[PDB]
Amino acid sequence: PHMFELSDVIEGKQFDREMLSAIFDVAREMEKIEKSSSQSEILKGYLMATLFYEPSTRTRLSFESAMKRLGGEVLTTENAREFSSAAKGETLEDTIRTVEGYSDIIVMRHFESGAARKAAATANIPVINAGDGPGEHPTQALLDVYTIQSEIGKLDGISVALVGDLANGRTVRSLAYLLAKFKDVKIYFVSPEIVKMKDDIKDYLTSSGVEWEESSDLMEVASKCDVVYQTRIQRERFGERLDLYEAARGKFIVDKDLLGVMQKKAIIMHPLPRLDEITADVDADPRAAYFRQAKNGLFIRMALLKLLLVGW
Amino acid sequence: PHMFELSDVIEGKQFDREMLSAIFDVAREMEKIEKSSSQSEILKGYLMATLFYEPSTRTRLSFESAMKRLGGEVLTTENAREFSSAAKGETLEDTIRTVEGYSDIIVMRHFESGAARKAAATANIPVINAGDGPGEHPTQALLDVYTIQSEIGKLDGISVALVGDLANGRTVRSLAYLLAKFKDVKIYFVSPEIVKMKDDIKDYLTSSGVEWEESSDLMEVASKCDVVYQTRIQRERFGERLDLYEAARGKFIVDKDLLGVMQKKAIIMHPLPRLDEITADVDADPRAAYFRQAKNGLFIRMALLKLLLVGW
Amino acid sequence: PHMFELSDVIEGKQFDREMLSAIFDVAREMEKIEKSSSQSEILKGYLMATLFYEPSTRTRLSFESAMKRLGGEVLTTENAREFSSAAKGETLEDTIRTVEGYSDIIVMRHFESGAARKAAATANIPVINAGDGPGEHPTQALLDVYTIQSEIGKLDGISVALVGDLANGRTVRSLAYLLAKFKDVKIYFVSPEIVKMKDDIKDYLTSSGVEWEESSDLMEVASKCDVVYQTRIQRERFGERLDLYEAARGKFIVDKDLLGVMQKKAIIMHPLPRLDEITADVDADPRAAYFRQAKNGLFIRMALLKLLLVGW
Ligand SMILES: O=c1ccn([C@@H]2O[C@H](COP(=O)(O)O)[C@@H](O)[C@H]2O)c(=O)[nH]1
Ligand SMILES: O=c1ccn([C@@H]2O[C@H](COP(=O)(O)O)[C@@H](O)[C@H]2O)c(=O)[nH]1
Ligand SMILES: O=c1ccn([C@@H]2O[C@H](COP(=O)(O)O)[C@@H](O)[C@H]2O)c(=O)[nH]1
């Protein structure tokens, strides 16, 4: 029993292999707490301030549920820019130093990348980054990795297909970053070439020992993977090249025909929300894990709230 | 002591005479709980997810108060369409299967009729329909009927005037539907002809044994009724016929002159919010029951939350 | 131990010197409660309804934190005008008489001055005015005065500089009003002439025994004051006179050069949010009290909630 080594949860680079493993063990303990028919009091007396600068229902409710499942309570806003209705203006550092007097922990979702680290540096209470604009989304990365460990039973020696908009894929990028901290990992980059993964991730994996391989053929890669992590490709990413959007039409979808070629022990993941890139009849298959994945986000966020406030 | 026979609260057709009577008895028990100076713990450890797709303050707070008066806690949103601020799109069934991992019961207010039943079919936790777009609003119907039983002392053998926009009146339609399950009921349809009640309700009552009668003369009908259930008529319902809107001007209002012709034991009901169809000086009369009616909504919604989560 | 002499908290004129002093003593007790590692239950079983007609994050969270630090619970809205999503319209008195059935105390922030007093007159539960449109903001006045007493150690015999837009300054006006209830007070009105304080305050102070003096020279006045209460001047207040806005540019700012001329025992206050009228490097100085000031708002609002619901 000791203090959590992290003062804040901001970026994926904060985590090493052993810290991840320990957090995942705590998440399993949080699942036991959530399953119990007794109300937990671990965080009784603690207040979480949800500081969202835009509405983002799923992830906010996941945090607020985690706090209340542990016996803590919540202050919420999805209008953080509106500091006062009578005097215009808002400054992140002033909001933090004001709200930290009302709460014991801040969960912030800003619109600008880099805001989370500034808030952590300013606040004298722990801060969790719930989505740093277009930047880091660390608890989504943790729950993604945790879901793989939970569903497949291991993180060493697995094969993961990262599908969709990889060039601009916030979560596929951070998922590959955390998976590179484990051994004998193989990652498939499944995409159209114009939204293929960028070199910084490609070069970080190689220099990490991770084997990787690019493809345009999801149906082939699928049969060899433990995990198929799906994300959308927005039509706007193709610009004027509707010939390429017509040539990709139906080639990166997860549907029953794709499930038919996958191992019985592989899973489909999707951070949500989804468009048509996973058909509705996939949901009935036990390998459709994207809703168990969301539930794992509750356990992970319970773990971080607990560790940051009362330690190991 | 046993399980509630309803898995969800969606539509008025789910309820028969005896179920209504039993629910109303539970609502009376909930009133005793709310009146107590001790905090209830009946729903300690349970979380209610308020899934509103549009802001609707009164009815949301009625639900959230009911949960907290019973010792449960709440997750709220009036922006349910905004599943994620970073990835556009929302799908009802995906929202339900995501949020049900954070909560024990869902109270949803969608914008499209039929959404509540789909959510119930998808969710593995109970669902309450708090307003199904232009469709069912069952807890408003229950609290309307409960208010009559509470104020008049009976439901068999009463006379109720349904006033206002009856053709498109969501709540007058469902109120008449539930009242038709009791005996020797008489219903007055008080309206301009162009917003008169529709045949489906007229034919369901007749085939239910309920006696009914249409009128354009509220001042006559009022003196014969136990209940005057008032609703607005929006000027837009008249279209271009401002001659009819001028001919109806002042004819379907509840004012002191109308109270002067009503029995001392009759009541005024209004689901709220009201416009000018009930004058402010009616409020001081003990027969103005529309605020006691709103309070009864708390008791009814306490009862449903309790029954759905812990049974009879 | 007895009943709070105030049924509601609406206007500064409700408070006399002795009531203020007693409230400030309770606020000090509330600070002890907030500091404790035990969850308070003083307001267990009580519900606060936050009825905000516009979003105003800081002050809402200050109230909602105060309630939860005392063990009470909260119903919130920043969309109070949206009584129902299906039927348009909202009437203050109908909202109050509806929501008071769901709660034990109402904290309202309306958009129109005079709304708070109407709500108090209508409600059978206590009401706190959290910002009456352009009108009274009493808890901000209380926390402003309380901050001075807490930081300087006294209210009799002090010198306070009120800086910024004084003509339209909601909080400088009410701060001077409450300070005039103490002895040997001296107030400096530091402003451009076109946003100078108005006669009603100037004449109320004189008739109160308070000495006052107007100035355009913050750097002089600062060295003689116990308190420098800063507020912005919006460029729009100058209208077309950009020559005056250019002549005032840099003359009413709080910066390190101004701190260099102030007593070591003086403080900087600012109700927040601020623009550029306090430079960021002032924050590191122990005399920058605007964030301790916000924290004092929590204690004051805890005190009022406690007194109004359970008395002295
Ligand atoms: O089709 C999709 C759906 C989601 N996401 C990522 O998953 C995150 C889900 O977390 P949140 O936005 O709900 O908090 C999004 O922010 C986004 O970065 C994608 O990349 N593609
Ligand atoms: O003048 C009125 C006021 C309310 N309603 C009905 O009463 C409901 C009140 O419930 P809620 O909208 O507040 O949840 C409305 O949705 C609407 O269907 C009317 O028909 N006419
Ligand atoms: O530069 C400023 C900042 C704030 N205020 C006053 O301080 C109040 C802060 O309280 P609130 O608006 O956050 O509730 C504002 O409403 C406003 O009246 C000013 O006069 N000038």
PDB file of N, CA and C in Angstrom, chain B residues 224-254:
ATOM      1  N   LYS B 224     -70.915  20.604 -14.313  1.00  0.00           N
ATOM      2  CA  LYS B 224     -71.327  19.216 -14.159  1.00  0.00           C
ATOM      3  C   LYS B 224     -70.163  18.260 -13.956  1.00  0.00           C
ATOM      4  N   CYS B 225     -68.937  18.759 -13.860  1.00  0.00           N
ATOM      5  CA  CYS B 225     -67.762  17.907 -13.899  1.00  0.00           C
ATOM      6  C   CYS B 225     -67.084  17.834 -12.539  1.00  0.00           C
ATOM      7  N   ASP B 226     -66.511  16.663 -12.258  1.00  0.00           N
ATOM      8  CA  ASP B 226     -65.606  16.530 -11.126  1.00  0.00           C
ATOM      9  C   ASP B 226     -64.243  17.130 -11.437  1.00  0.00           C
ATOM     10  N   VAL B 227     -63.823  17.073 -12.698  1.00  0.00           N
ATOM     11  CA  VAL B 227     -62.486  17.485 -13.105  1.00  0.00           C
ATOM     12  C   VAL B 227     -62.590  18.303 -14.383  1.00  0.00           C
ATOM     13  N   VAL B 228     -61.812  19.380 -14.449  1.00  0.00           N
ATOM     14  CA  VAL B 228     -61.628  20.165 -15.664  1.00  0.00           C
ATOM     15  C   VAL B 228     -60.137  20.108 -15.980  1.00  0.00           C
ATOM     16  N   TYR B 229     -59.764  19.270 -16.948  1.00  0.00           N
ATOM     17  CA  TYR B 229     -58.375  19.069 -17.353  1.00  0.00           C
ATOM     18  C   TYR B 229     -58.090  19.996 -18.531  1.00  0.00           C
ATOM     19  N   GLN B 230     -57.322  21.053 -18.283  1.00  0.00           N
ATOM     20  CA  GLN B 230     -57.124  22.127 -19.246  1.00  0.00           C
ATOM     21  C   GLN B 230     -55.819  21.935 -20.004  1.00  0.00           C
ATOM     22  N   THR B 231     -55.848  22.273 -21.291  1.00  0.00           N
ATOM     23  CA  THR B 231     -54.651  22.336 -22.114  1.00  0.00           C
ATOM     24  C   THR B 231     -54.811  23.494 -23.088  1.00  0.00           C
ATOM     25  N   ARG B 232     -53.686  23.958 -23.615  1.00  0.00           N
ATOM     26  CA  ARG B 232     -53.709  25.112 -24.495  1.00  0.00           C
ATOM     27  C   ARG B 232     -54.260  24.738 -25.871  1.00  0.00           C
ATOM     28  N   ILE B 233     -54.601  25.769 -26.638  1.00  0.00           N
ATOM     29  CA  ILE B 233     -54.828  25.668 -28.075  1.00  0.00           C
ATOM     30  C   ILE B 233     -53.862  26.647 -28.729  1.00  0.00           C
ATOM     31  N   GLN B 234     -52.881  26.133 -29.463  1.00  0.00           N
ATOM     32  CA  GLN B 234     -51.914  27.010 -30.108  1.00  0.00           C
ATOM     33  C   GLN B 234     -52.560  27.728 -31.287  1.00  0.00           C
ATOM     34  N   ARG B 235     -52.378  29.051 -31.339  1.00  0.00           N
ATOM     35  CA  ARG B 235     -52.917  29.852 -32.433  1.00  0.00           C
ATOM     36  C   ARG B 235     -52.640  29.223 -33.791  1.00  0.00           C
ATOM     37  N   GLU B 236     -51.507  28.540 -33.941  1.00  0.00           N
ATOM     38  CA  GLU B 236     -51.154  27.962 -35.231  1.00  0.00           C
ATOM     39  C   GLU B 236     -52.096  26.836 -35.643  1.00  0.00           C
ATOM     40  N   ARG B 237     -52.825  26.242 -34.698  1.00  0.00           N
ATOM     41  CA  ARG B 237     -53.749  25.172 -35.046  1.00  0.00           C
ATOM     42  C   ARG B 237     -54.898  25.678 -35.903  1.00  0.00           C
ATOM     43  N   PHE B 238     -55.181  26.978 -35.856  1.00  0.00           N
ATOM     44  CA  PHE B 238     -56.254  27.561 -36.647  1.00  0.00           C
ATOM     45  C   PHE B 238     -55.828  27.893 -38.068  1.00  0.00           C
ATOM     46  N   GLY B 239     -54.533  27.847 -38.365  1.00  0.00           N
ATOM     47  CA  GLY B 239     -54.085  28.163 -39.710  1.00  0.00           C
ATOM     48  C   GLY B 239     -54.493  29.570 -40.097  1.00  0.00           C
ATOM     49  N   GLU B 240     -55.169  29.685 -41.238  1.00  0.00           N
ATOM     50  CA  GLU B 240     -55.632  30.979 -41.717  1.00  0.00           C
ATOM     51  C   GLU B 240     -56.954  31.401 -41.090  1.00  0.00           C
ATOM     52  N   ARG B 241     -57.669  30.480 -40.442  1.00  0.00           N
ATOM     53  CA  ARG B 241     -58.996  30.767 -39.898  1.00  0.00           C
ATOM     54  C   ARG B 241     -58.858  31.564 -38.600  1.00  0.00           C
ATOM     55  N   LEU B 242     -58.442  32.824 -38.748  1.00  0.00           N
ATOM     56  CA  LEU B 242     -58.421  33.720 -37.599  1.00  0.00           C
ATOM     57  C   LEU B 242     -59.823  34.158 -37.202  1.00  0.00           C
ATOM     58  N   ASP B 243     -60.810  33.981 -38.085  1.00  0.00           N
ATOM     59  CA  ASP B 243     -62.197  34.188 -37.687  1.00  0.00           C
ATOM     60  C   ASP B 243     -62.610  33.171 -36.630  1.00  0.00           C
ATOM     61  N   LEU B 244     -62.137  31.932 -36.759  1.00  0.00           N
ATOM     62  CA  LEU B 244     -62.429  30.920 -35.754  1.00  0.00           C
ATOM     63  C   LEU B 244     -61.608  31.128 -34.489  1.00  0.00           C
ATOM     64  N   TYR B 245     -60.372  31.604 -34.635  1.00  0.00           N
ATOM     65  CA  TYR B 245     -59.555  31.936 -33.477  1.00  0.00           C
ATOM     66  C   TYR B 245     -60.086  33.176 -32.765  1.00  0.00           C
ATOM     67  N   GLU B 246     -60.708  34.097 -33.506  1.00  0.00           N
ATOM     68  CA  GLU B 246     -61.389  35.223 -32.878  1.00  0.00           C
ATOM     69  C   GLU B 246     -62.712  34.798 -32.250  1.00  0.00           C
ATOM     70  N   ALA B 247     -63.385  33.804 -32.838  1.00  0.00           N
ATOM     71  CA  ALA B 247     -64.643  33.306 -32.291  1.00  0.00           C
ATOM     72  C   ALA B 247     -64.434  32.420 -31.072  1.00  0.00           C
ATOM     73  N   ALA B 248     -63.272  31.788 -30.956  1.00  0.00           N
ATOM     74  CA  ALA B 248     -62.917  31.010 -29.775  1.00  0.00           C
ATOM     75  C   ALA B 248     -62.236  31.856 -28.708  1.00  0.00           C
ATOM     76  N   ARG B 249     -61.988  33.142 -28.981  1.00  0.00           N
ATOM     77  CA  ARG B 249     -61.195  33.951 -28.042  1.00  0.00           C
ATOM     78  C   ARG B 249     -61.937  34.192 -26.714  1.00  0.00           C
ATOM     79  N   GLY B 250     -61.491  33.522 -25.667  1.00  0.00           N
ATOM     80  CA  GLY B 250     -62.110  33.691 -24.360  1.00  0.00           C
ATOM     81  C   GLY B 250     -63.150  32.657 -24.023  1.00  0.00           C
ATOM     82  N   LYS B 251     -63.338  31.651 -24.876  1.00  0.00           N
ATOM     83  CA  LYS B 251     -64.402  30.676 -24.688  1.00  0.00           C
ATOM     84  C   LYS B 251     -63.932  29.389 -24.024  1.00  0.00           C
ATOM     85  N   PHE B 252     -62.623  29.141 -23.969  1.00  0.00           N
ATOM     86  CA  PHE B 252     -62.077  27.916 -23.397  1.00  0.00           C
ATOM     87  C   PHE B 252     -61.038  28.241 -22.334  1.00  0.00           C
ATOM     88  N   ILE B 253     -61.223  29.367 -21.657  1.00  0.00           N
ATOM     89  CA  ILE B 253     -60.341  29.837 -20.607  1.00  0.00           C
ATOM     90  C   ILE B 253     -60.901  29.377 -19.277  1.00  0.00           C
ATOM     91  N   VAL B 254     -60.006  29.117 -18.333  1.00  0.00           N
ATOM     92  CA  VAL B 254     -60.377  28.858 -16.948  1.00  0.00           C
ATOM     93  C   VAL B 254     -60.073  30.129 -16.166  1.00  0.00           C
TER      94      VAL B 254
END
